[PDB]
Design a binder for this molecule. Sequence first.
Ligand SMILES: [Cl-]
Ligand SMILES: [Cl-]
Lengths: 421, 422
Amino acid sequence: GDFDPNKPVVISEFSPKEGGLGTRMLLYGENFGSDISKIKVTIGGQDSKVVGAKGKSLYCVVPAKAYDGDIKLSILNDEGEEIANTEANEKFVYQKKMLVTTFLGTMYDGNTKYDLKDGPFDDCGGFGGAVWLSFDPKNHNHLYLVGEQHPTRLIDFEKEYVSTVYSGLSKVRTICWTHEADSMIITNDQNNNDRPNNYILTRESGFKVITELTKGQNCNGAETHPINGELYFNSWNAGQVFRYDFTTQETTPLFTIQDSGWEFHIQFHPSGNYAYIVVVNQHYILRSDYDWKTKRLTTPYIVCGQQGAKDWVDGVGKKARMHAPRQGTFVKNPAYKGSSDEYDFYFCDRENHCIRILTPQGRVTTFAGRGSNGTSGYNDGDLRQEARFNHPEGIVYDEERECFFIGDRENRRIRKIGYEE
Amino acid sequence: TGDFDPNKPVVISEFSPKEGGLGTRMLLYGENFGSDISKIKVTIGGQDSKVVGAKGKSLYCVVPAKAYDGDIKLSILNDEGEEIANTEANEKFVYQKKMLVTTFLGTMYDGNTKYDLKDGPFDDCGGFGGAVWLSFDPKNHNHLYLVGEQHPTRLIDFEKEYVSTVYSGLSKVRTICWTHEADSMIITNDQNNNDRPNNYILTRESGFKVITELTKGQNCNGAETHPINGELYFNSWNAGQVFRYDFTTQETTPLFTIQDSGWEFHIQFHPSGNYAYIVVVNQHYILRSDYDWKTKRLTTPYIVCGQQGAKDWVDGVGKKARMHAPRQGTFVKNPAYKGSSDEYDFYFCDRENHCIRILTPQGRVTTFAGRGSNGTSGYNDGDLRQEARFNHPEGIVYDEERECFFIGDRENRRIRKIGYEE
Ligand SMILES: [Cl-]
Ligand SMILES: [Cl-]
């Protein structure tokens, strides 16, 4: 069918009635012509690419942001001017999905270069490192990050500004908070047993006065109990767990995990009933139940992965495989409402370039990454089909903003995972 | 064999199922339980668990309410009920909480035949004459208002745990709605004189106690404001006419007729304000009226569910579903609809079916609660579908902060609650 300029253009029906981004829509009607270049379809105020035209029908692809679902069609001349227009009587029903996007940071010269600077959200350069992410418990607009040899920085959502908190520490691994949040605990990984492993930054000083809390070699992270407030940290040498009491300033060695050279961090469940022990250099996770009577973590047991087996394998418990797991985050799952454990554990699998999910029952799945048929890279979009990370390290779930923030190391950016906006 | 031996140990070897909740029939395996049910005491999560069978090497018990910890203890007793042997299971039972119907407020006396109409604390406020429409104060989530037809407009104050009377005297109060700024409460009166008021305004400045007439009109079955643009929509039963009132110009515009004469209905807007449900109380069906954002008006309605004039109790899609005297509804955010155009379900009272129904955005009607205990009307708390009963439920509100439903259960003179086990 050829377009007739002296005849009206009409939409009789469209299908499917429902869908979202990338849905292949079929539009029935009259006098569309068969030249794709002279047809303009707008869905929800957004341009929709026409992929087929047969005079009485046309195919188009539902674009991103087409939320209103209002369908407009125009027939154009060679110069792109509208010569006929029509509108559908019914609106298309748009279902939003989750996407990986770039929240903060940028690189320039075809993503080969980046600048280390303070500045607004739109002009703050690139992040040297974001290995651990933590919100201020007293201010949900303040998101802190540590970057190993790179500075400790602040992402302020209220002012839309990125600033430097503290510079100079050789290898900052974690951030945790005292029960009253009057202090920030910064953990430094260094080989001298007479030099500090844990530092404190006080709130009253604007986190400018730094204090040595404990001394110790090769500490890969520290974490406070969310109810009783005591600090747990390690030493890589024998893979020993230490308990520090803030009131008595006493350190107690607890158990050893397994063998020498055990690089791990401890992450408590929000109830404080247990912690996951994430062994970064041995590619497996353990669970350590909390003894409320002794106010101590107890002998842990393997929950998933296999000690020393680097791979990407989804499955239950010991059948699962990972490669360099980093920070995790406890996420409230509405499907678990009423159960003993209402949370899933989402974590960065750094050398698998993806985000994994560990359920309370020990099942490991992949949430995001490894899209576009590869592993490492820099790609936004569909969580499993398109999205790619390059050594994701830090991660935090934002319950108020209903999204994830990820420290994507080689891409020098803070990535976001949330529903399209 | 199968008899308890006082000189041998009592132990638990295993139990099944490993998971369940309230009323789960558990099977315990072990040694030396005996076969006398009266001398066996099982405790699950610190709560007494009734033993229903005992065969020496096995027993049956029922998981009680509040057994959340799942720790299992067993004791063998003597004739006087004292513990003579004690054991414990190595594993904890995994308890999954469920929703229950409970009585939140109000009471009746003399075998639920009489009730007192009085102001008082939550524990001693008598019974409710009526709670046909429930509405939270948008500026104070501790203040829950109710209207009761011929009975007074009352306040349920969660902060003070007190029930008070706000206004008395109106013949048939149907609905409550609020001005966009919530400086005023709109109270709708159903009366036959066209020269007498249908809509009253209660100022916040007076604690919602001083009244003023807003509009005049006969047989109005309810009014509702647009949640974004703030204009008022109300009806007239006579021709089933919808009217639009603009607060700034004080101009009433007749909009559209639903169908035929004697159409008793209320209008309830979706939280987005993109559409409203038109609930036809005396014709047992619901319509949807899309909002035209350009003209700032509701438009020509279309049937969403139920069959005009066909009274019944039938779960189903669209016109295959049946109801009998639907009353107030409440929009509840469903986490399963995250990202979709409509994220809410519509829960409503089906007065003469004595239950709570759910209308999904796709037009499916199901039953949420009521009609338990092999009956329809009654007064029973517990399991939503197996035990719970209502008697002419009318008002309903979902409390997002307290994560529960509050229901105006007319003949039971109580405010019922639907929430998870606590
Ligand atoms: Cl892929
Ligand atoms: Cl039943």
